């Protein structure tokens, strides 16, 4: 799964689009992402980068 979209196939483009659409729907339906959006984004980014 390469990061660059130009070298990777359109079926995987459709799969990635469907997956990110479902993830967007779930995160938009989450009660945590209704009161403090940017705070939750910062916490998630901090967790993801301290994982890295």
């Amino acid at each position: 799964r390469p990061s660059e979209l130009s070298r990777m196939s359109a079926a995987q483009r459709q799969q990635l689009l469907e997956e990110e659409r479902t993830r967007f729907q779930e995160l938009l339906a989450s009660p945590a992402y209704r009161a403090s959006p940017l705070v939750a984004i910062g916490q998630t980014l901090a967790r993801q980068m301290q994982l890295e």
């Binding site: 990061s3 660059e4 979209l5 130009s6 359109a10 483009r13 459709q14 990635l16 689009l17 469907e18 990110e20 659409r21 993830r23 967007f24 995160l27 938009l28 992402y33 959006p37 940017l38 984004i41 910062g42 998630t44 980014l45 901090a46 993801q48 980068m49 890295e52």
Partner: protein
């Protein structure tokens, strides 16, 4: 130290000291300071109170001034006499200034004006300049003009250095004078023109310039007086090449002629030929500046004084009587200005003849032809530098008339069968192509159809005759005169009657003559683009469009060709045609697409025709076509889906008409179809589809938030699509959806916050979609700059700092772009709170990331050094970056015509001439200028096969 203070006399005295006691103004200050004005001659105390009196006096105590004007006149008059007897400067200067203010605001007044006027000839410059400016302010702020004019006349007649002083008075005061005093002043001025002194001549020419430049009315200056002073000014013309007074003499004669034309135009045009002849003679001066000035003056007179009256004058022939004869005479002068004796001003003469053609040709053509023949003869010189200027002049004359009158004057010698191969008037065809814009199409028919047909036949006949050299030349000829049709189609005057004679000819020339087709197509487009202004013209174009449509459709749909120019012609040509035959051809094209016995190339060509026919049909045909194309959005062929999305974009492209009605009728169907076909959209098909979505975001109602929030991930993934056009469309669609949410609520900032939190979660998931959302926020930050609220931007910037720690190069690059946009956009006062965090995240980036992204980091450090202190950036960066920093600082230290040979080029002084010596050189011959020139007369390795080697 105490003049620059705000409390000083520089600023605050002009504002708050005028309000004396709370009310502005009271002269009780002045009424109390008579006692210092009388019997006291102390310096720097009289001067200071005079300064304050001058400064405060402008704040309009006008009824009080009218009342005690007698008291002020007597007081300041005795001050004048006492200071003249004593001999001081500053007190005298500001008392002159305050008397000037008093006389401006308001029998004895004539005496006060005389007392103010008498101190101009006072030898001290400070007294004289103040008196002059005061008199000028009094007159321009008139019953006193006669007295000061007589005073100036008597002061000149009495006198040598003061002569220039009241000449400066005359320069500044001539427009505000009565007519008899203007006449007497000009008589005295010509009397001092009888002297040979240079400075008086230059200053009084400046006085004439100020007199005629202001454009005085009939009361100040009459037309007869202007004619008399014009005829009197002809007697000096200093010598030929003085260039300081000759410039002023030309300028004042130009202004006098302009004023005379403005007063009475026929007399001005009658007096113009003498001035034009003298200007043409003065063009033989060796100075370049006087030549440019004469060209500019004659150009200005031609544009402003000659051009707008030619509808009144009408056509001029060789036997004109009135102002037309004068126009013929000054044309004769500018025609005589084309002989061999000039040979250095031919650039200026040809430019002035070019603007002469543009201004004059439509009514001056009967006499125009001899000059045209002469200038055609001038191009026969072996070496010509003004070839581009000559071609511009011939093009201007063609733009004035057209090729019919020009070819009556200078005929083309390419009429059929020639003997030699050196066509001498071959430049005429490029000139005609470049500059025909206002002609008749019937001349193009009756002249360029049989001649080009015979030349094409001769070219083909010589092609089968073995001679491949002459045949190529004749084919290039017939191509060149077939390129005149776009010029003739610019703005024809008889295209309502002459288009019938070219319809079948253009049809066969676009059918079985490929070599002309593109130009022919361009001609059609050119015609439409500026020829359907009238209604009978557009009716004729439709009446032949009903025949031209199958021809163009078959030309585009044939297998292999210039398909794209044909497509553009079809696009405009279908925007200008009737809807019923559009519906018929749309039905035929739908039949051709739905026919399974058609090839894929033919199917795609007919789909392109469907794309062209889609916005021009009615709502029923558009709805039927949409019903046919709707199952094709899920086709596995990327081309079919691309053409389907192009159809959906084109039907939604029209803001008004049947397309908008179809969109309003089928909005829900289009929304559910576009949401259903989102999953199975191919990569090229993203490029039109977004535009179609764009065309349905601009007119979207308030109850459509679900559609937009479902389209968002597709738009972001298209902001990181492969195609640059798809990325541009996705960025535009993001901006347009942001605009669309600025219409659904009352608070714009809260609506933008909602739009952002609908696109914010993309910073959470996969790497490429994280970079997608960073690029989306980068694009949105440049458009809605302050409207989301900078503090939120700061939070976003902080998040980007975490994304500055990412391993992937795309996320780092997008974060750097967002940081650059944030530095550009949001405020430095809020930057200074957040410099340290963002640039600390910059500092601990990597070695590889720092090395690869050296351009962006260099630009960011440059912007930070520009916006903040260099020492701060030096303090907060680590060691190695400091090296680059000083280089950046050193950077900020360092910051403070159409011939073959000309195109194939490896890319005092102008008065030089070359004679040539054949018959003896007869200078009196009219064709001598052909023998007088204006310019100086006179790598790879080939292989064994003979093919060149290129590296």
């Amino acid at each position: 130290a105490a003049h620059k203070e705000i409390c000083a006399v520089l600023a605050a005295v002009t504002e708050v000291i005028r309000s004396q006691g709370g009310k502005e103004t009271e002269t009780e200050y002045f009424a109390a300071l008579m006692t210092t004005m009388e019997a006291v001659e102390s310096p720097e105390s009289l001067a200071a109170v005079a300064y304050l009196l001058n400064l405060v006096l402008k704040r309009v105590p006008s009824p009080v001034l009218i009342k005690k004007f007698s008291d002020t006149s007597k007081a300041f008059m005795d001050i004048m006499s006492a200071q003249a007897s004593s001999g001081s400067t500053s007190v005298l200067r500001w008392v002159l200034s305050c008397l000037a203010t008093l006389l401006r605001k308001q029998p004895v007044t004539l005496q006060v004006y005389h007392g103010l006027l008498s101190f101009t000839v006072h030898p001290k410059p400070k007294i004289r300049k103040a008196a002059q400016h005061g008199v000028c302010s009094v007159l321009k702020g008139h019953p006193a003009a006669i007295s000061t004019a007589k005073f100036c006349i008597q002061e000149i007649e009495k006198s040598a250095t003061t002569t220039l002083h009241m000449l400066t008075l005359l320069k500044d005061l001539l427009p505000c004078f009565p007519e008899g005093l203007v006449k007497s002043c000009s008589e005295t001025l010509l009397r001092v023109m009888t002297l040979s002194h240079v400075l008086v001549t230059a200053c009084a020419m400046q006085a004439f310039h100020s007199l005629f430049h202001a454009r005085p009315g009939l009361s100040t200056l009459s037309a007869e007086l202007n004619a008399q002073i014009i005829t009197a000014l002809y007697d000096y013309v200093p010598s030929e090449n003085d260039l300081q007074p000759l410039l002023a003499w030309l300028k004042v004669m130009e202004k006098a002629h302009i004023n005379l034309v403005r007063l009475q135009w026929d007399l001005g045009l009658g007096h113009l030929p003498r001035f034009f002849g003298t200007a043409v003679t003065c063009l033989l001066s060796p100075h370049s500046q006087v030549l440019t000035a004469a060209t500019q003056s004659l150009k200005e007179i031609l544009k402003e004084c000659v051009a707008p009256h030619m509808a009144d004058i009408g056509s001029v022939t060789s036997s004109a009587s009135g102002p037309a004869q004068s126009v013929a005479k000054m044309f004769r002068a500018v025609e005589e200005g084309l002989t061999y004796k000039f040979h250095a001003a031919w650039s200026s003469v040809l430019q002035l003849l070019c603007v002469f053609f543009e201004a004059c040709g439509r009514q001056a053509h009967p006499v125009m032809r001899k000059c045209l023949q002469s200038l055609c003869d001038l191009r026969l010189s072996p070496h010509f530098p003004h070839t581009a200027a000559l071609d511009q002049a011939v093009g201007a004359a063609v733009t004035s008339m057209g090729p019919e009158v020009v070819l009556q004057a200078v005929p083309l010698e390419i009429d059929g069968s020639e003997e030699t191969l050196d066509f001498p008037r071959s430049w005429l065809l490029p000139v005609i192509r470049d500059h025909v814009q206002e002609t008749r199409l019937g001349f193009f028919t009756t002249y360029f159809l049989p001649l080009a047909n015979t030349l094409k036949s001769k070219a083909m006949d010589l092609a089968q005759a073995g001679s491949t050299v002459e045949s190529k030349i004749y084919d290039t000829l017939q191509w060149q005169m077939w390129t005149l049709l776009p010029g003739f189609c610019t703005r024809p005057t008889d295209v309502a009657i002459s288009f019938k004679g070219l319809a079948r000819t253009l049809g066969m020339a676009i059918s079985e003559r490929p070599d002309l087709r593109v130009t022919v197509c361009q001609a059609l487009r050119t015609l439409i683009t500026k020829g359907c202004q009238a209604e009978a013209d557009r009716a004729e174009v439709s009446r032949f469009a009903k025949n031209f449509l199958p021809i163009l459709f078959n030309l585009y749909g044939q297998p292999v060709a210039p398909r794209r120019a044909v497509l553009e012609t079809i696009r405009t040509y279908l925007t200008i045609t009737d809807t019923q035959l559009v519906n018929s051809l749309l039905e035929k094209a739908s039949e051709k697409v739905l026919d399974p016995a058609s090839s894929d190339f033919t199917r795609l060509s007919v789909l392109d025709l469907v794309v062209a026919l889609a916005p021009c049909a009615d709502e029923a045909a558009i709805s039927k076509l949409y019903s046919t194309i709707r199952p094709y959005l899920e086709s596995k062929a990327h081309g079919v889906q691309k053409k389907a999305y192009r159809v959906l974009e084109e039907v939604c492209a029209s803001p008004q008409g049947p397309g908008a009605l179809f969109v309003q009728s089928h909005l829900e169907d289009l929304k559910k179809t576009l949401l259903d076909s989102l999953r199975s959209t191919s990569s090229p098909a993203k490029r039109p589809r977004l535009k179609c979505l764009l065309h349905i975001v601009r007119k979207l109602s308030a109850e459509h938030k679900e559609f937009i929030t479902a389209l968002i991930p597709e738009v972001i993934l298209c902001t990181k699509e492969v195609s640059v056009g798809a990325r541009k469309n996705a960025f535009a669609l993001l901006v347009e959806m942001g605009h669309a949410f600025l219409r659904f609520g009352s608070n714009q900032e809260e609506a933008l916050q909602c739009y952002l939190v609908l696109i914010y979660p993309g910073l959470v998931g996969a790497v490429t979609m994280v970079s997608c959302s960073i690029l989306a926020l980068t694009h949105l930050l440049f458009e809605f700059k302050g409207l989301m609220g900078t503090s939120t931007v700061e939070q976003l910037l902080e998040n980007v700092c975490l994304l500055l720690a990412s391993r992937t190069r795309d996320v780092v690059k997008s974060a750097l772009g967002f940081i650059k946009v944030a530095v550009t956009v949001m405020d430095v006062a809020h930057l200074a709170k957040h410099v340290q965090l963002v640039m600390e995240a910059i500092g601990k980036l990597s070695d590889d990331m720092r090395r690869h992204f050296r351009m962006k980091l260099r630009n960011l450090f440059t912007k930070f050094i520009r916006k903040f202190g260099f020492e701060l950036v030096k303090r907060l960066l680590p060691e190695e970056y400091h090296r680059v920093l000083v280089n950046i600082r050193k950077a900020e230290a360092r910051a403070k015509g159409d011939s073959i040979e000309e195109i194939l080029a490896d890319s005092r002084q102008r008065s030089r001439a070359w004679l040539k010596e054949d018959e003896p050189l007869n200078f009196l011959d009219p064709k001598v200028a052909q023998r007088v020139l204006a310019t100086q007369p006179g790598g790879f390795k080939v292989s064994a096969d003979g093919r060149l080697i290129i590296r």
